[PDB]
Structure formats: C-alpha cells, structure tokens
C-alpha cells in the first residue's frame, strides 16, 4: 500500500 | 556515480543433459541502470529472454536477473554478454556447469 | 521472525526525447508483489504474487493513482536537482527512492525508512527516529529546510508506524502459505582436484527463502577465510535463492574441513563434511 499523502518535491 | 556490473551465469537447477532447465544471468552492483544483457547459445543471441523488474541494493547499485528456458547438451555452449557505460567492450561470461 | 514491506522507485531522465523511464517495485520480505513500469502497456500497478491478486478493483485503482503521482513527483525532482547541481539539459540523470516499514518478532512496528539518492549517491534520508533528516550536501540541505517547513517527517511517520504496518500484516496473512513459510537451504558438497596435491571443496545452499544466509568454513573446528571464495547470494528465478562457498585444501585432508550453514529455516545450523 503506497504513501497516500501528496509527495513533497525535493 | 559509475559502478561496473558483477556477473553470475548459472542454471536454476543442477544441470543434466537432455533435462529442461533455466539459464540465469544475474547482473548486480552497477550504476547507472542502462545495461545490455543477452544470453548466447553457441555465440548467437537467444530471442525468448525475460528479465526481472529493476531494483537496487542499500548502496543504490542496481540488480537484474535475465533468464530463459534451456535444455543443456554435452556440445552446446551458453554465455551471458553484458554491455554497460563502464565497459570499453561487451563482457562475455561463459556458463560453467558447477558455478 | 521480523517482516518488511518496501517500495523501490527509479526514474531515469531521457534528454533526447520524452519523459523519464519510471520503475516502481513493491516487496514483502524477499518477495516482489507489485510493479509499475512507465514503458509497459497497462499503465497500471500490476500484481507479481498470487496473494495480491485477491485485492479488488478499489485497491488496484488506488495503487495505480498513487504510483502515477509518485512518477510525476520524480519527474519534477529530476528537473529540480538539475537546477540545484547547475547541470545541463543534455545529460541523463537518475533519482532513486526507497521507503517501507519492519515489524518485529512481536508483530508490532520495529522501524521505518525513507531514503533518496541522486545519480547513485545518498541525497536525503529520514533518520531512525522518523523526526529528523540526514542531508548529504548543500542541495540536500535545501530539500531538508523545505521538508521541515512542510512537516514531511510527520506525514511519513504517520504512514510508517500506522498504514504501512497495517497493510504489511494484511499481506502477510493473505500470503501466509508462502510469506510465512521458511524454505531451509538444500545443502551438499562437491569435490574436484585442481592439482595432484590440492582439491576444491564447494558447499552449496540451494532453493532457500528468505535470502539471508551465512556459509562459513572451519578447519579442525576453527574459522578459515584464507583460500576460500564466497559468491554473492543470487536468485534461482522461482522466488528462492542460491549461494556457495569454496575452500582449497590439501588432497587427503578434506575430512578436516566443515561447512557451517546458518538460516532462519534451520532450527540448528547445519555442518557438512566431505
Ligand atoms: Na561444484
Ligand atoms: Na531485523
Ligand atoms: Na505497469
Ligand atoms: Na505500465
Ligand atoms: Na545468516
């Protein structure tokens, strides 16, 4: 089950 | 940034002439991920060859398994041919029965 | 014993034409269970183990949405990092991300991780406390300041200690017939002369799962490393692993040498002697 929250870019 | 592939060429099962088996070429420890891997029967590229999905180790170096069904015989020669940006010429590793 | 869920993401820029190549893999322990490849036809998260196939369409729609969102983040990051490192648009570069969670012997949360690399070198990593970041260089320090302000560690800690271990335990139950089965190594020794005076003993471990194993040689009950060779653990291709260790011995003295095999599937370590 992948991370749900929108990923923060570097 | 550039790491050369380690190569193992081996059979899934103990090799017996006339008995169906799988020929494996395991490439690991390489960066970047772009790599050419062929399985050779008597110097000729095998068409049916599949590979695992790209993954990597703790050190970020990549590994792939390339494999095909094969029936070993007394006479037929098998090899793995690997090209990578770290190699000046494609590296050919012959399949040895008990390696 | 302990169990892990891990996702591995690789994105490789294609400066000549088009978008980066993106490959995502999911593992439970040493078992791949899902994949996404931007080059494949489906454009979906795909099953790679029978026990994940029982998940319904809601699951596959969700994992496809998330993995596509992950791919776009990595596409943007390749552009951001080219900027941070003052690199030209002409060269191919690589981003890698790995995250996941371990449960311990008590089946509770043990540890979480979230690690990022640029061109195969450490970039930024979540520390074991899941509260702080390890930034390798001043580009990664810029990311660290951004991620501190956005409370990224708090968002990942919530996933790693909660959602991640709940779904890991779900997968371990659904796939228990294989995921909770140990395959003890099938072991044997081979012998062949390398000269009139010396022979190679090769200790084989085959068809084992999980991959973690230790092969050691002793001579007269004491560890020997000199005149030995140990190959990297390698996949059989059927989900199990292989390894061998060899020692060169004086011909006729083979009986002095023992191969010791340690594996989770062995109640006691095995001792092999020619
Ligand atoms: Na052998
Ligand atoms: Na552990
Ligand atoms: Na896919
Ligand atoms: Na696809
Ligand atoms: Na071990």
Residue numbers in the entry:
A (entry chain C): 1 to 10
B (entry chain B): 1 to 99
C (entry chain A): 1 to 274
Quote the original article.
To study this aspect, we individually refolded and crystallized HLA-A*02:01 with spliced epitope candidate KRAS5−6/8−14 G12V, non-spliced epitope candidate KRAS5−14 G12V, as well as two control peptides (peptides #1 and #2), in which either the N-terminal residue or one of the central residues was substituted, as compared to the epitope candidates. Throughout these interfaces, extensive hydrophobic and hydrogen bonding networking is seen with the majority of peptide residues participating in the contact with HLA-I residues Y7, F9, M45, E63, K66, V67, H70, T73, T80, L81, Y84, Y99, Y116, T143, K146, W147, V152, Y159, W167, Y171.
In the KRAS2−35 G12V polypeptide digestion, we also identified the non-spliced epitope candidate KRAS5−14 G12V [KLVVVGAVGV]. Specifically, while the N-terminal and C-terminal ends of all four peptides match perfectly, structural superposition reveals conformations in the middle portions of peptide KRAS5−6/8−14 G12V and peptide #2 unique from the remaining two peptide ligands (KRAS5−14 G12V and peptide #1). In the latter two cases, the middle portions of the peptides containing P4, P5, and P6 residues bulge out of the binding pockets to accommodate both peptide ends inside the peptide-binding groove of the HLA-I molecule. In the HLA-I-KRAS5−14 G12V peptide complex, the HLA-A*02:01 K146 residue adopts a different orientation, due to which it interacts with only the terminal PΩ residue. In the HLA-A*02:01-KRAS5−14 G12V peptide complex, the middle portion that bulges out from the binding groove makes it more accessible for TCR recognition. The side chain of P4 V and P5 V residues are facing in an upward direction and can be easily accommodated into the binding pocket located over the central peptide, formed by the most structurally diverse CDR loops, CDR3α and CDR3β of the TCR.
